[PDB]
Amino acid sequence: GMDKYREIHNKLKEFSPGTLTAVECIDYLDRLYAVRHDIVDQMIKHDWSDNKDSEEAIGKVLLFAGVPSNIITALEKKIIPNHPTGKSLKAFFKMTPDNYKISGTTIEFVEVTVTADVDKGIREKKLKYEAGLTYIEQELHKFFLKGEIPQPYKITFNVVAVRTDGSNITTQWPSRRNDG
Ligand SMILES: [Mn+3]
Ligand SMILES: [Mn+3]
Ligand SMILES: [Mn+3]
C-alpha cells in the first residue's frame, strides 16, 4: 500500500529531498482510507440507496418517509434514553448516516466504516446511531397507537465495515454479523 508511495517518493529526488516521514505516511494512509470509504459508499448508492448523491440528515429522511412535519417537531424536545451523551432528537435529527432506503414505512440505514478493527468500527457506529434510531421507532409507534399517524414505522441500522487492508468486509445487521 505505502510501498508504492515509498517508491514514488524516492523518485521525486530534488522535489522531495527529505526521506519519507512516519507522520506523512500516516496522513497518506488516512487519505487512502477515506477514498476506500467513499468508493464503497458510492457502490451502495449506485444500486441500493435512495440517496444517490450525498448522505442525508435523519430528520429529512423521516419527512421523505411520510412522517408529518408536526410529528417531527414534537419529537425534537425528547431526550434519547440511554444515549452515551444524553443527546436530544433535535440534535440527532441533524446527523447524517451514509445511506438510507425507504420501503413504505420501513426505513433502512447503512453506515460505511473503513477500520483496522472491524469489531471496534462497528461498535463505534452503533454507539453513534442505534439508541437514537430505536427511540425514534418507539416514539413513532406511540403516535400510531394514538391514531396520529396511520401506520407505524420500522427503522433498521446496519454497518458495512471495510478492512483497511485487503478485500474483506463485515456486515452487521441488527441481530447478526457476517464477516466476509
Ligand atoms: Mn520527502
Ligand atoms: Mn458519512
Ligand atoms: Mn461512513
Author numbering: 0 to 179
Task: Please quote the authors directly.
Segmented negative strand RNA viruses of the arena-, bunya- and orthomyxovirus families uniquely carry out viral mRNA transcription by the cap-snatching mechanism.
To demonstrate the presence of a cap-snatching endonuclease domain in hantavirus L proteins we determine the crystal structure of the isolated Hantaan virus EN in complex with Mn2+ ions and characterize its endonuclease activity. Each protein binds two Mn2+ ions in the active site in a similar fashion to that observed for LACV and influenza. Overall, Hantaan EN conserves the two lobe shape of LACV but with the active site, which lies between the two lobes, being more accessible. The active site of Hantaan EN structure is configured very similarly to that of LACV and IAV ENs with two divalent cations bound in a canonical way. Mn1 is octahedrally coordinated by the side chains of amino acid residues H36, D97 (from the conserved PD motif) and E110, and the main chain carboxyl oxygen of V111. Mn2 is coordinated by D97 and E54 coming from the conserved flexible loop preceding helix αc. The Hantaan EN efficiency for single stranded RNA appears similar to IAV and LACV but it is able to cleave structured RNA more efficiently than either IAV or LACV, probably due to the higher accessibility to the active site.
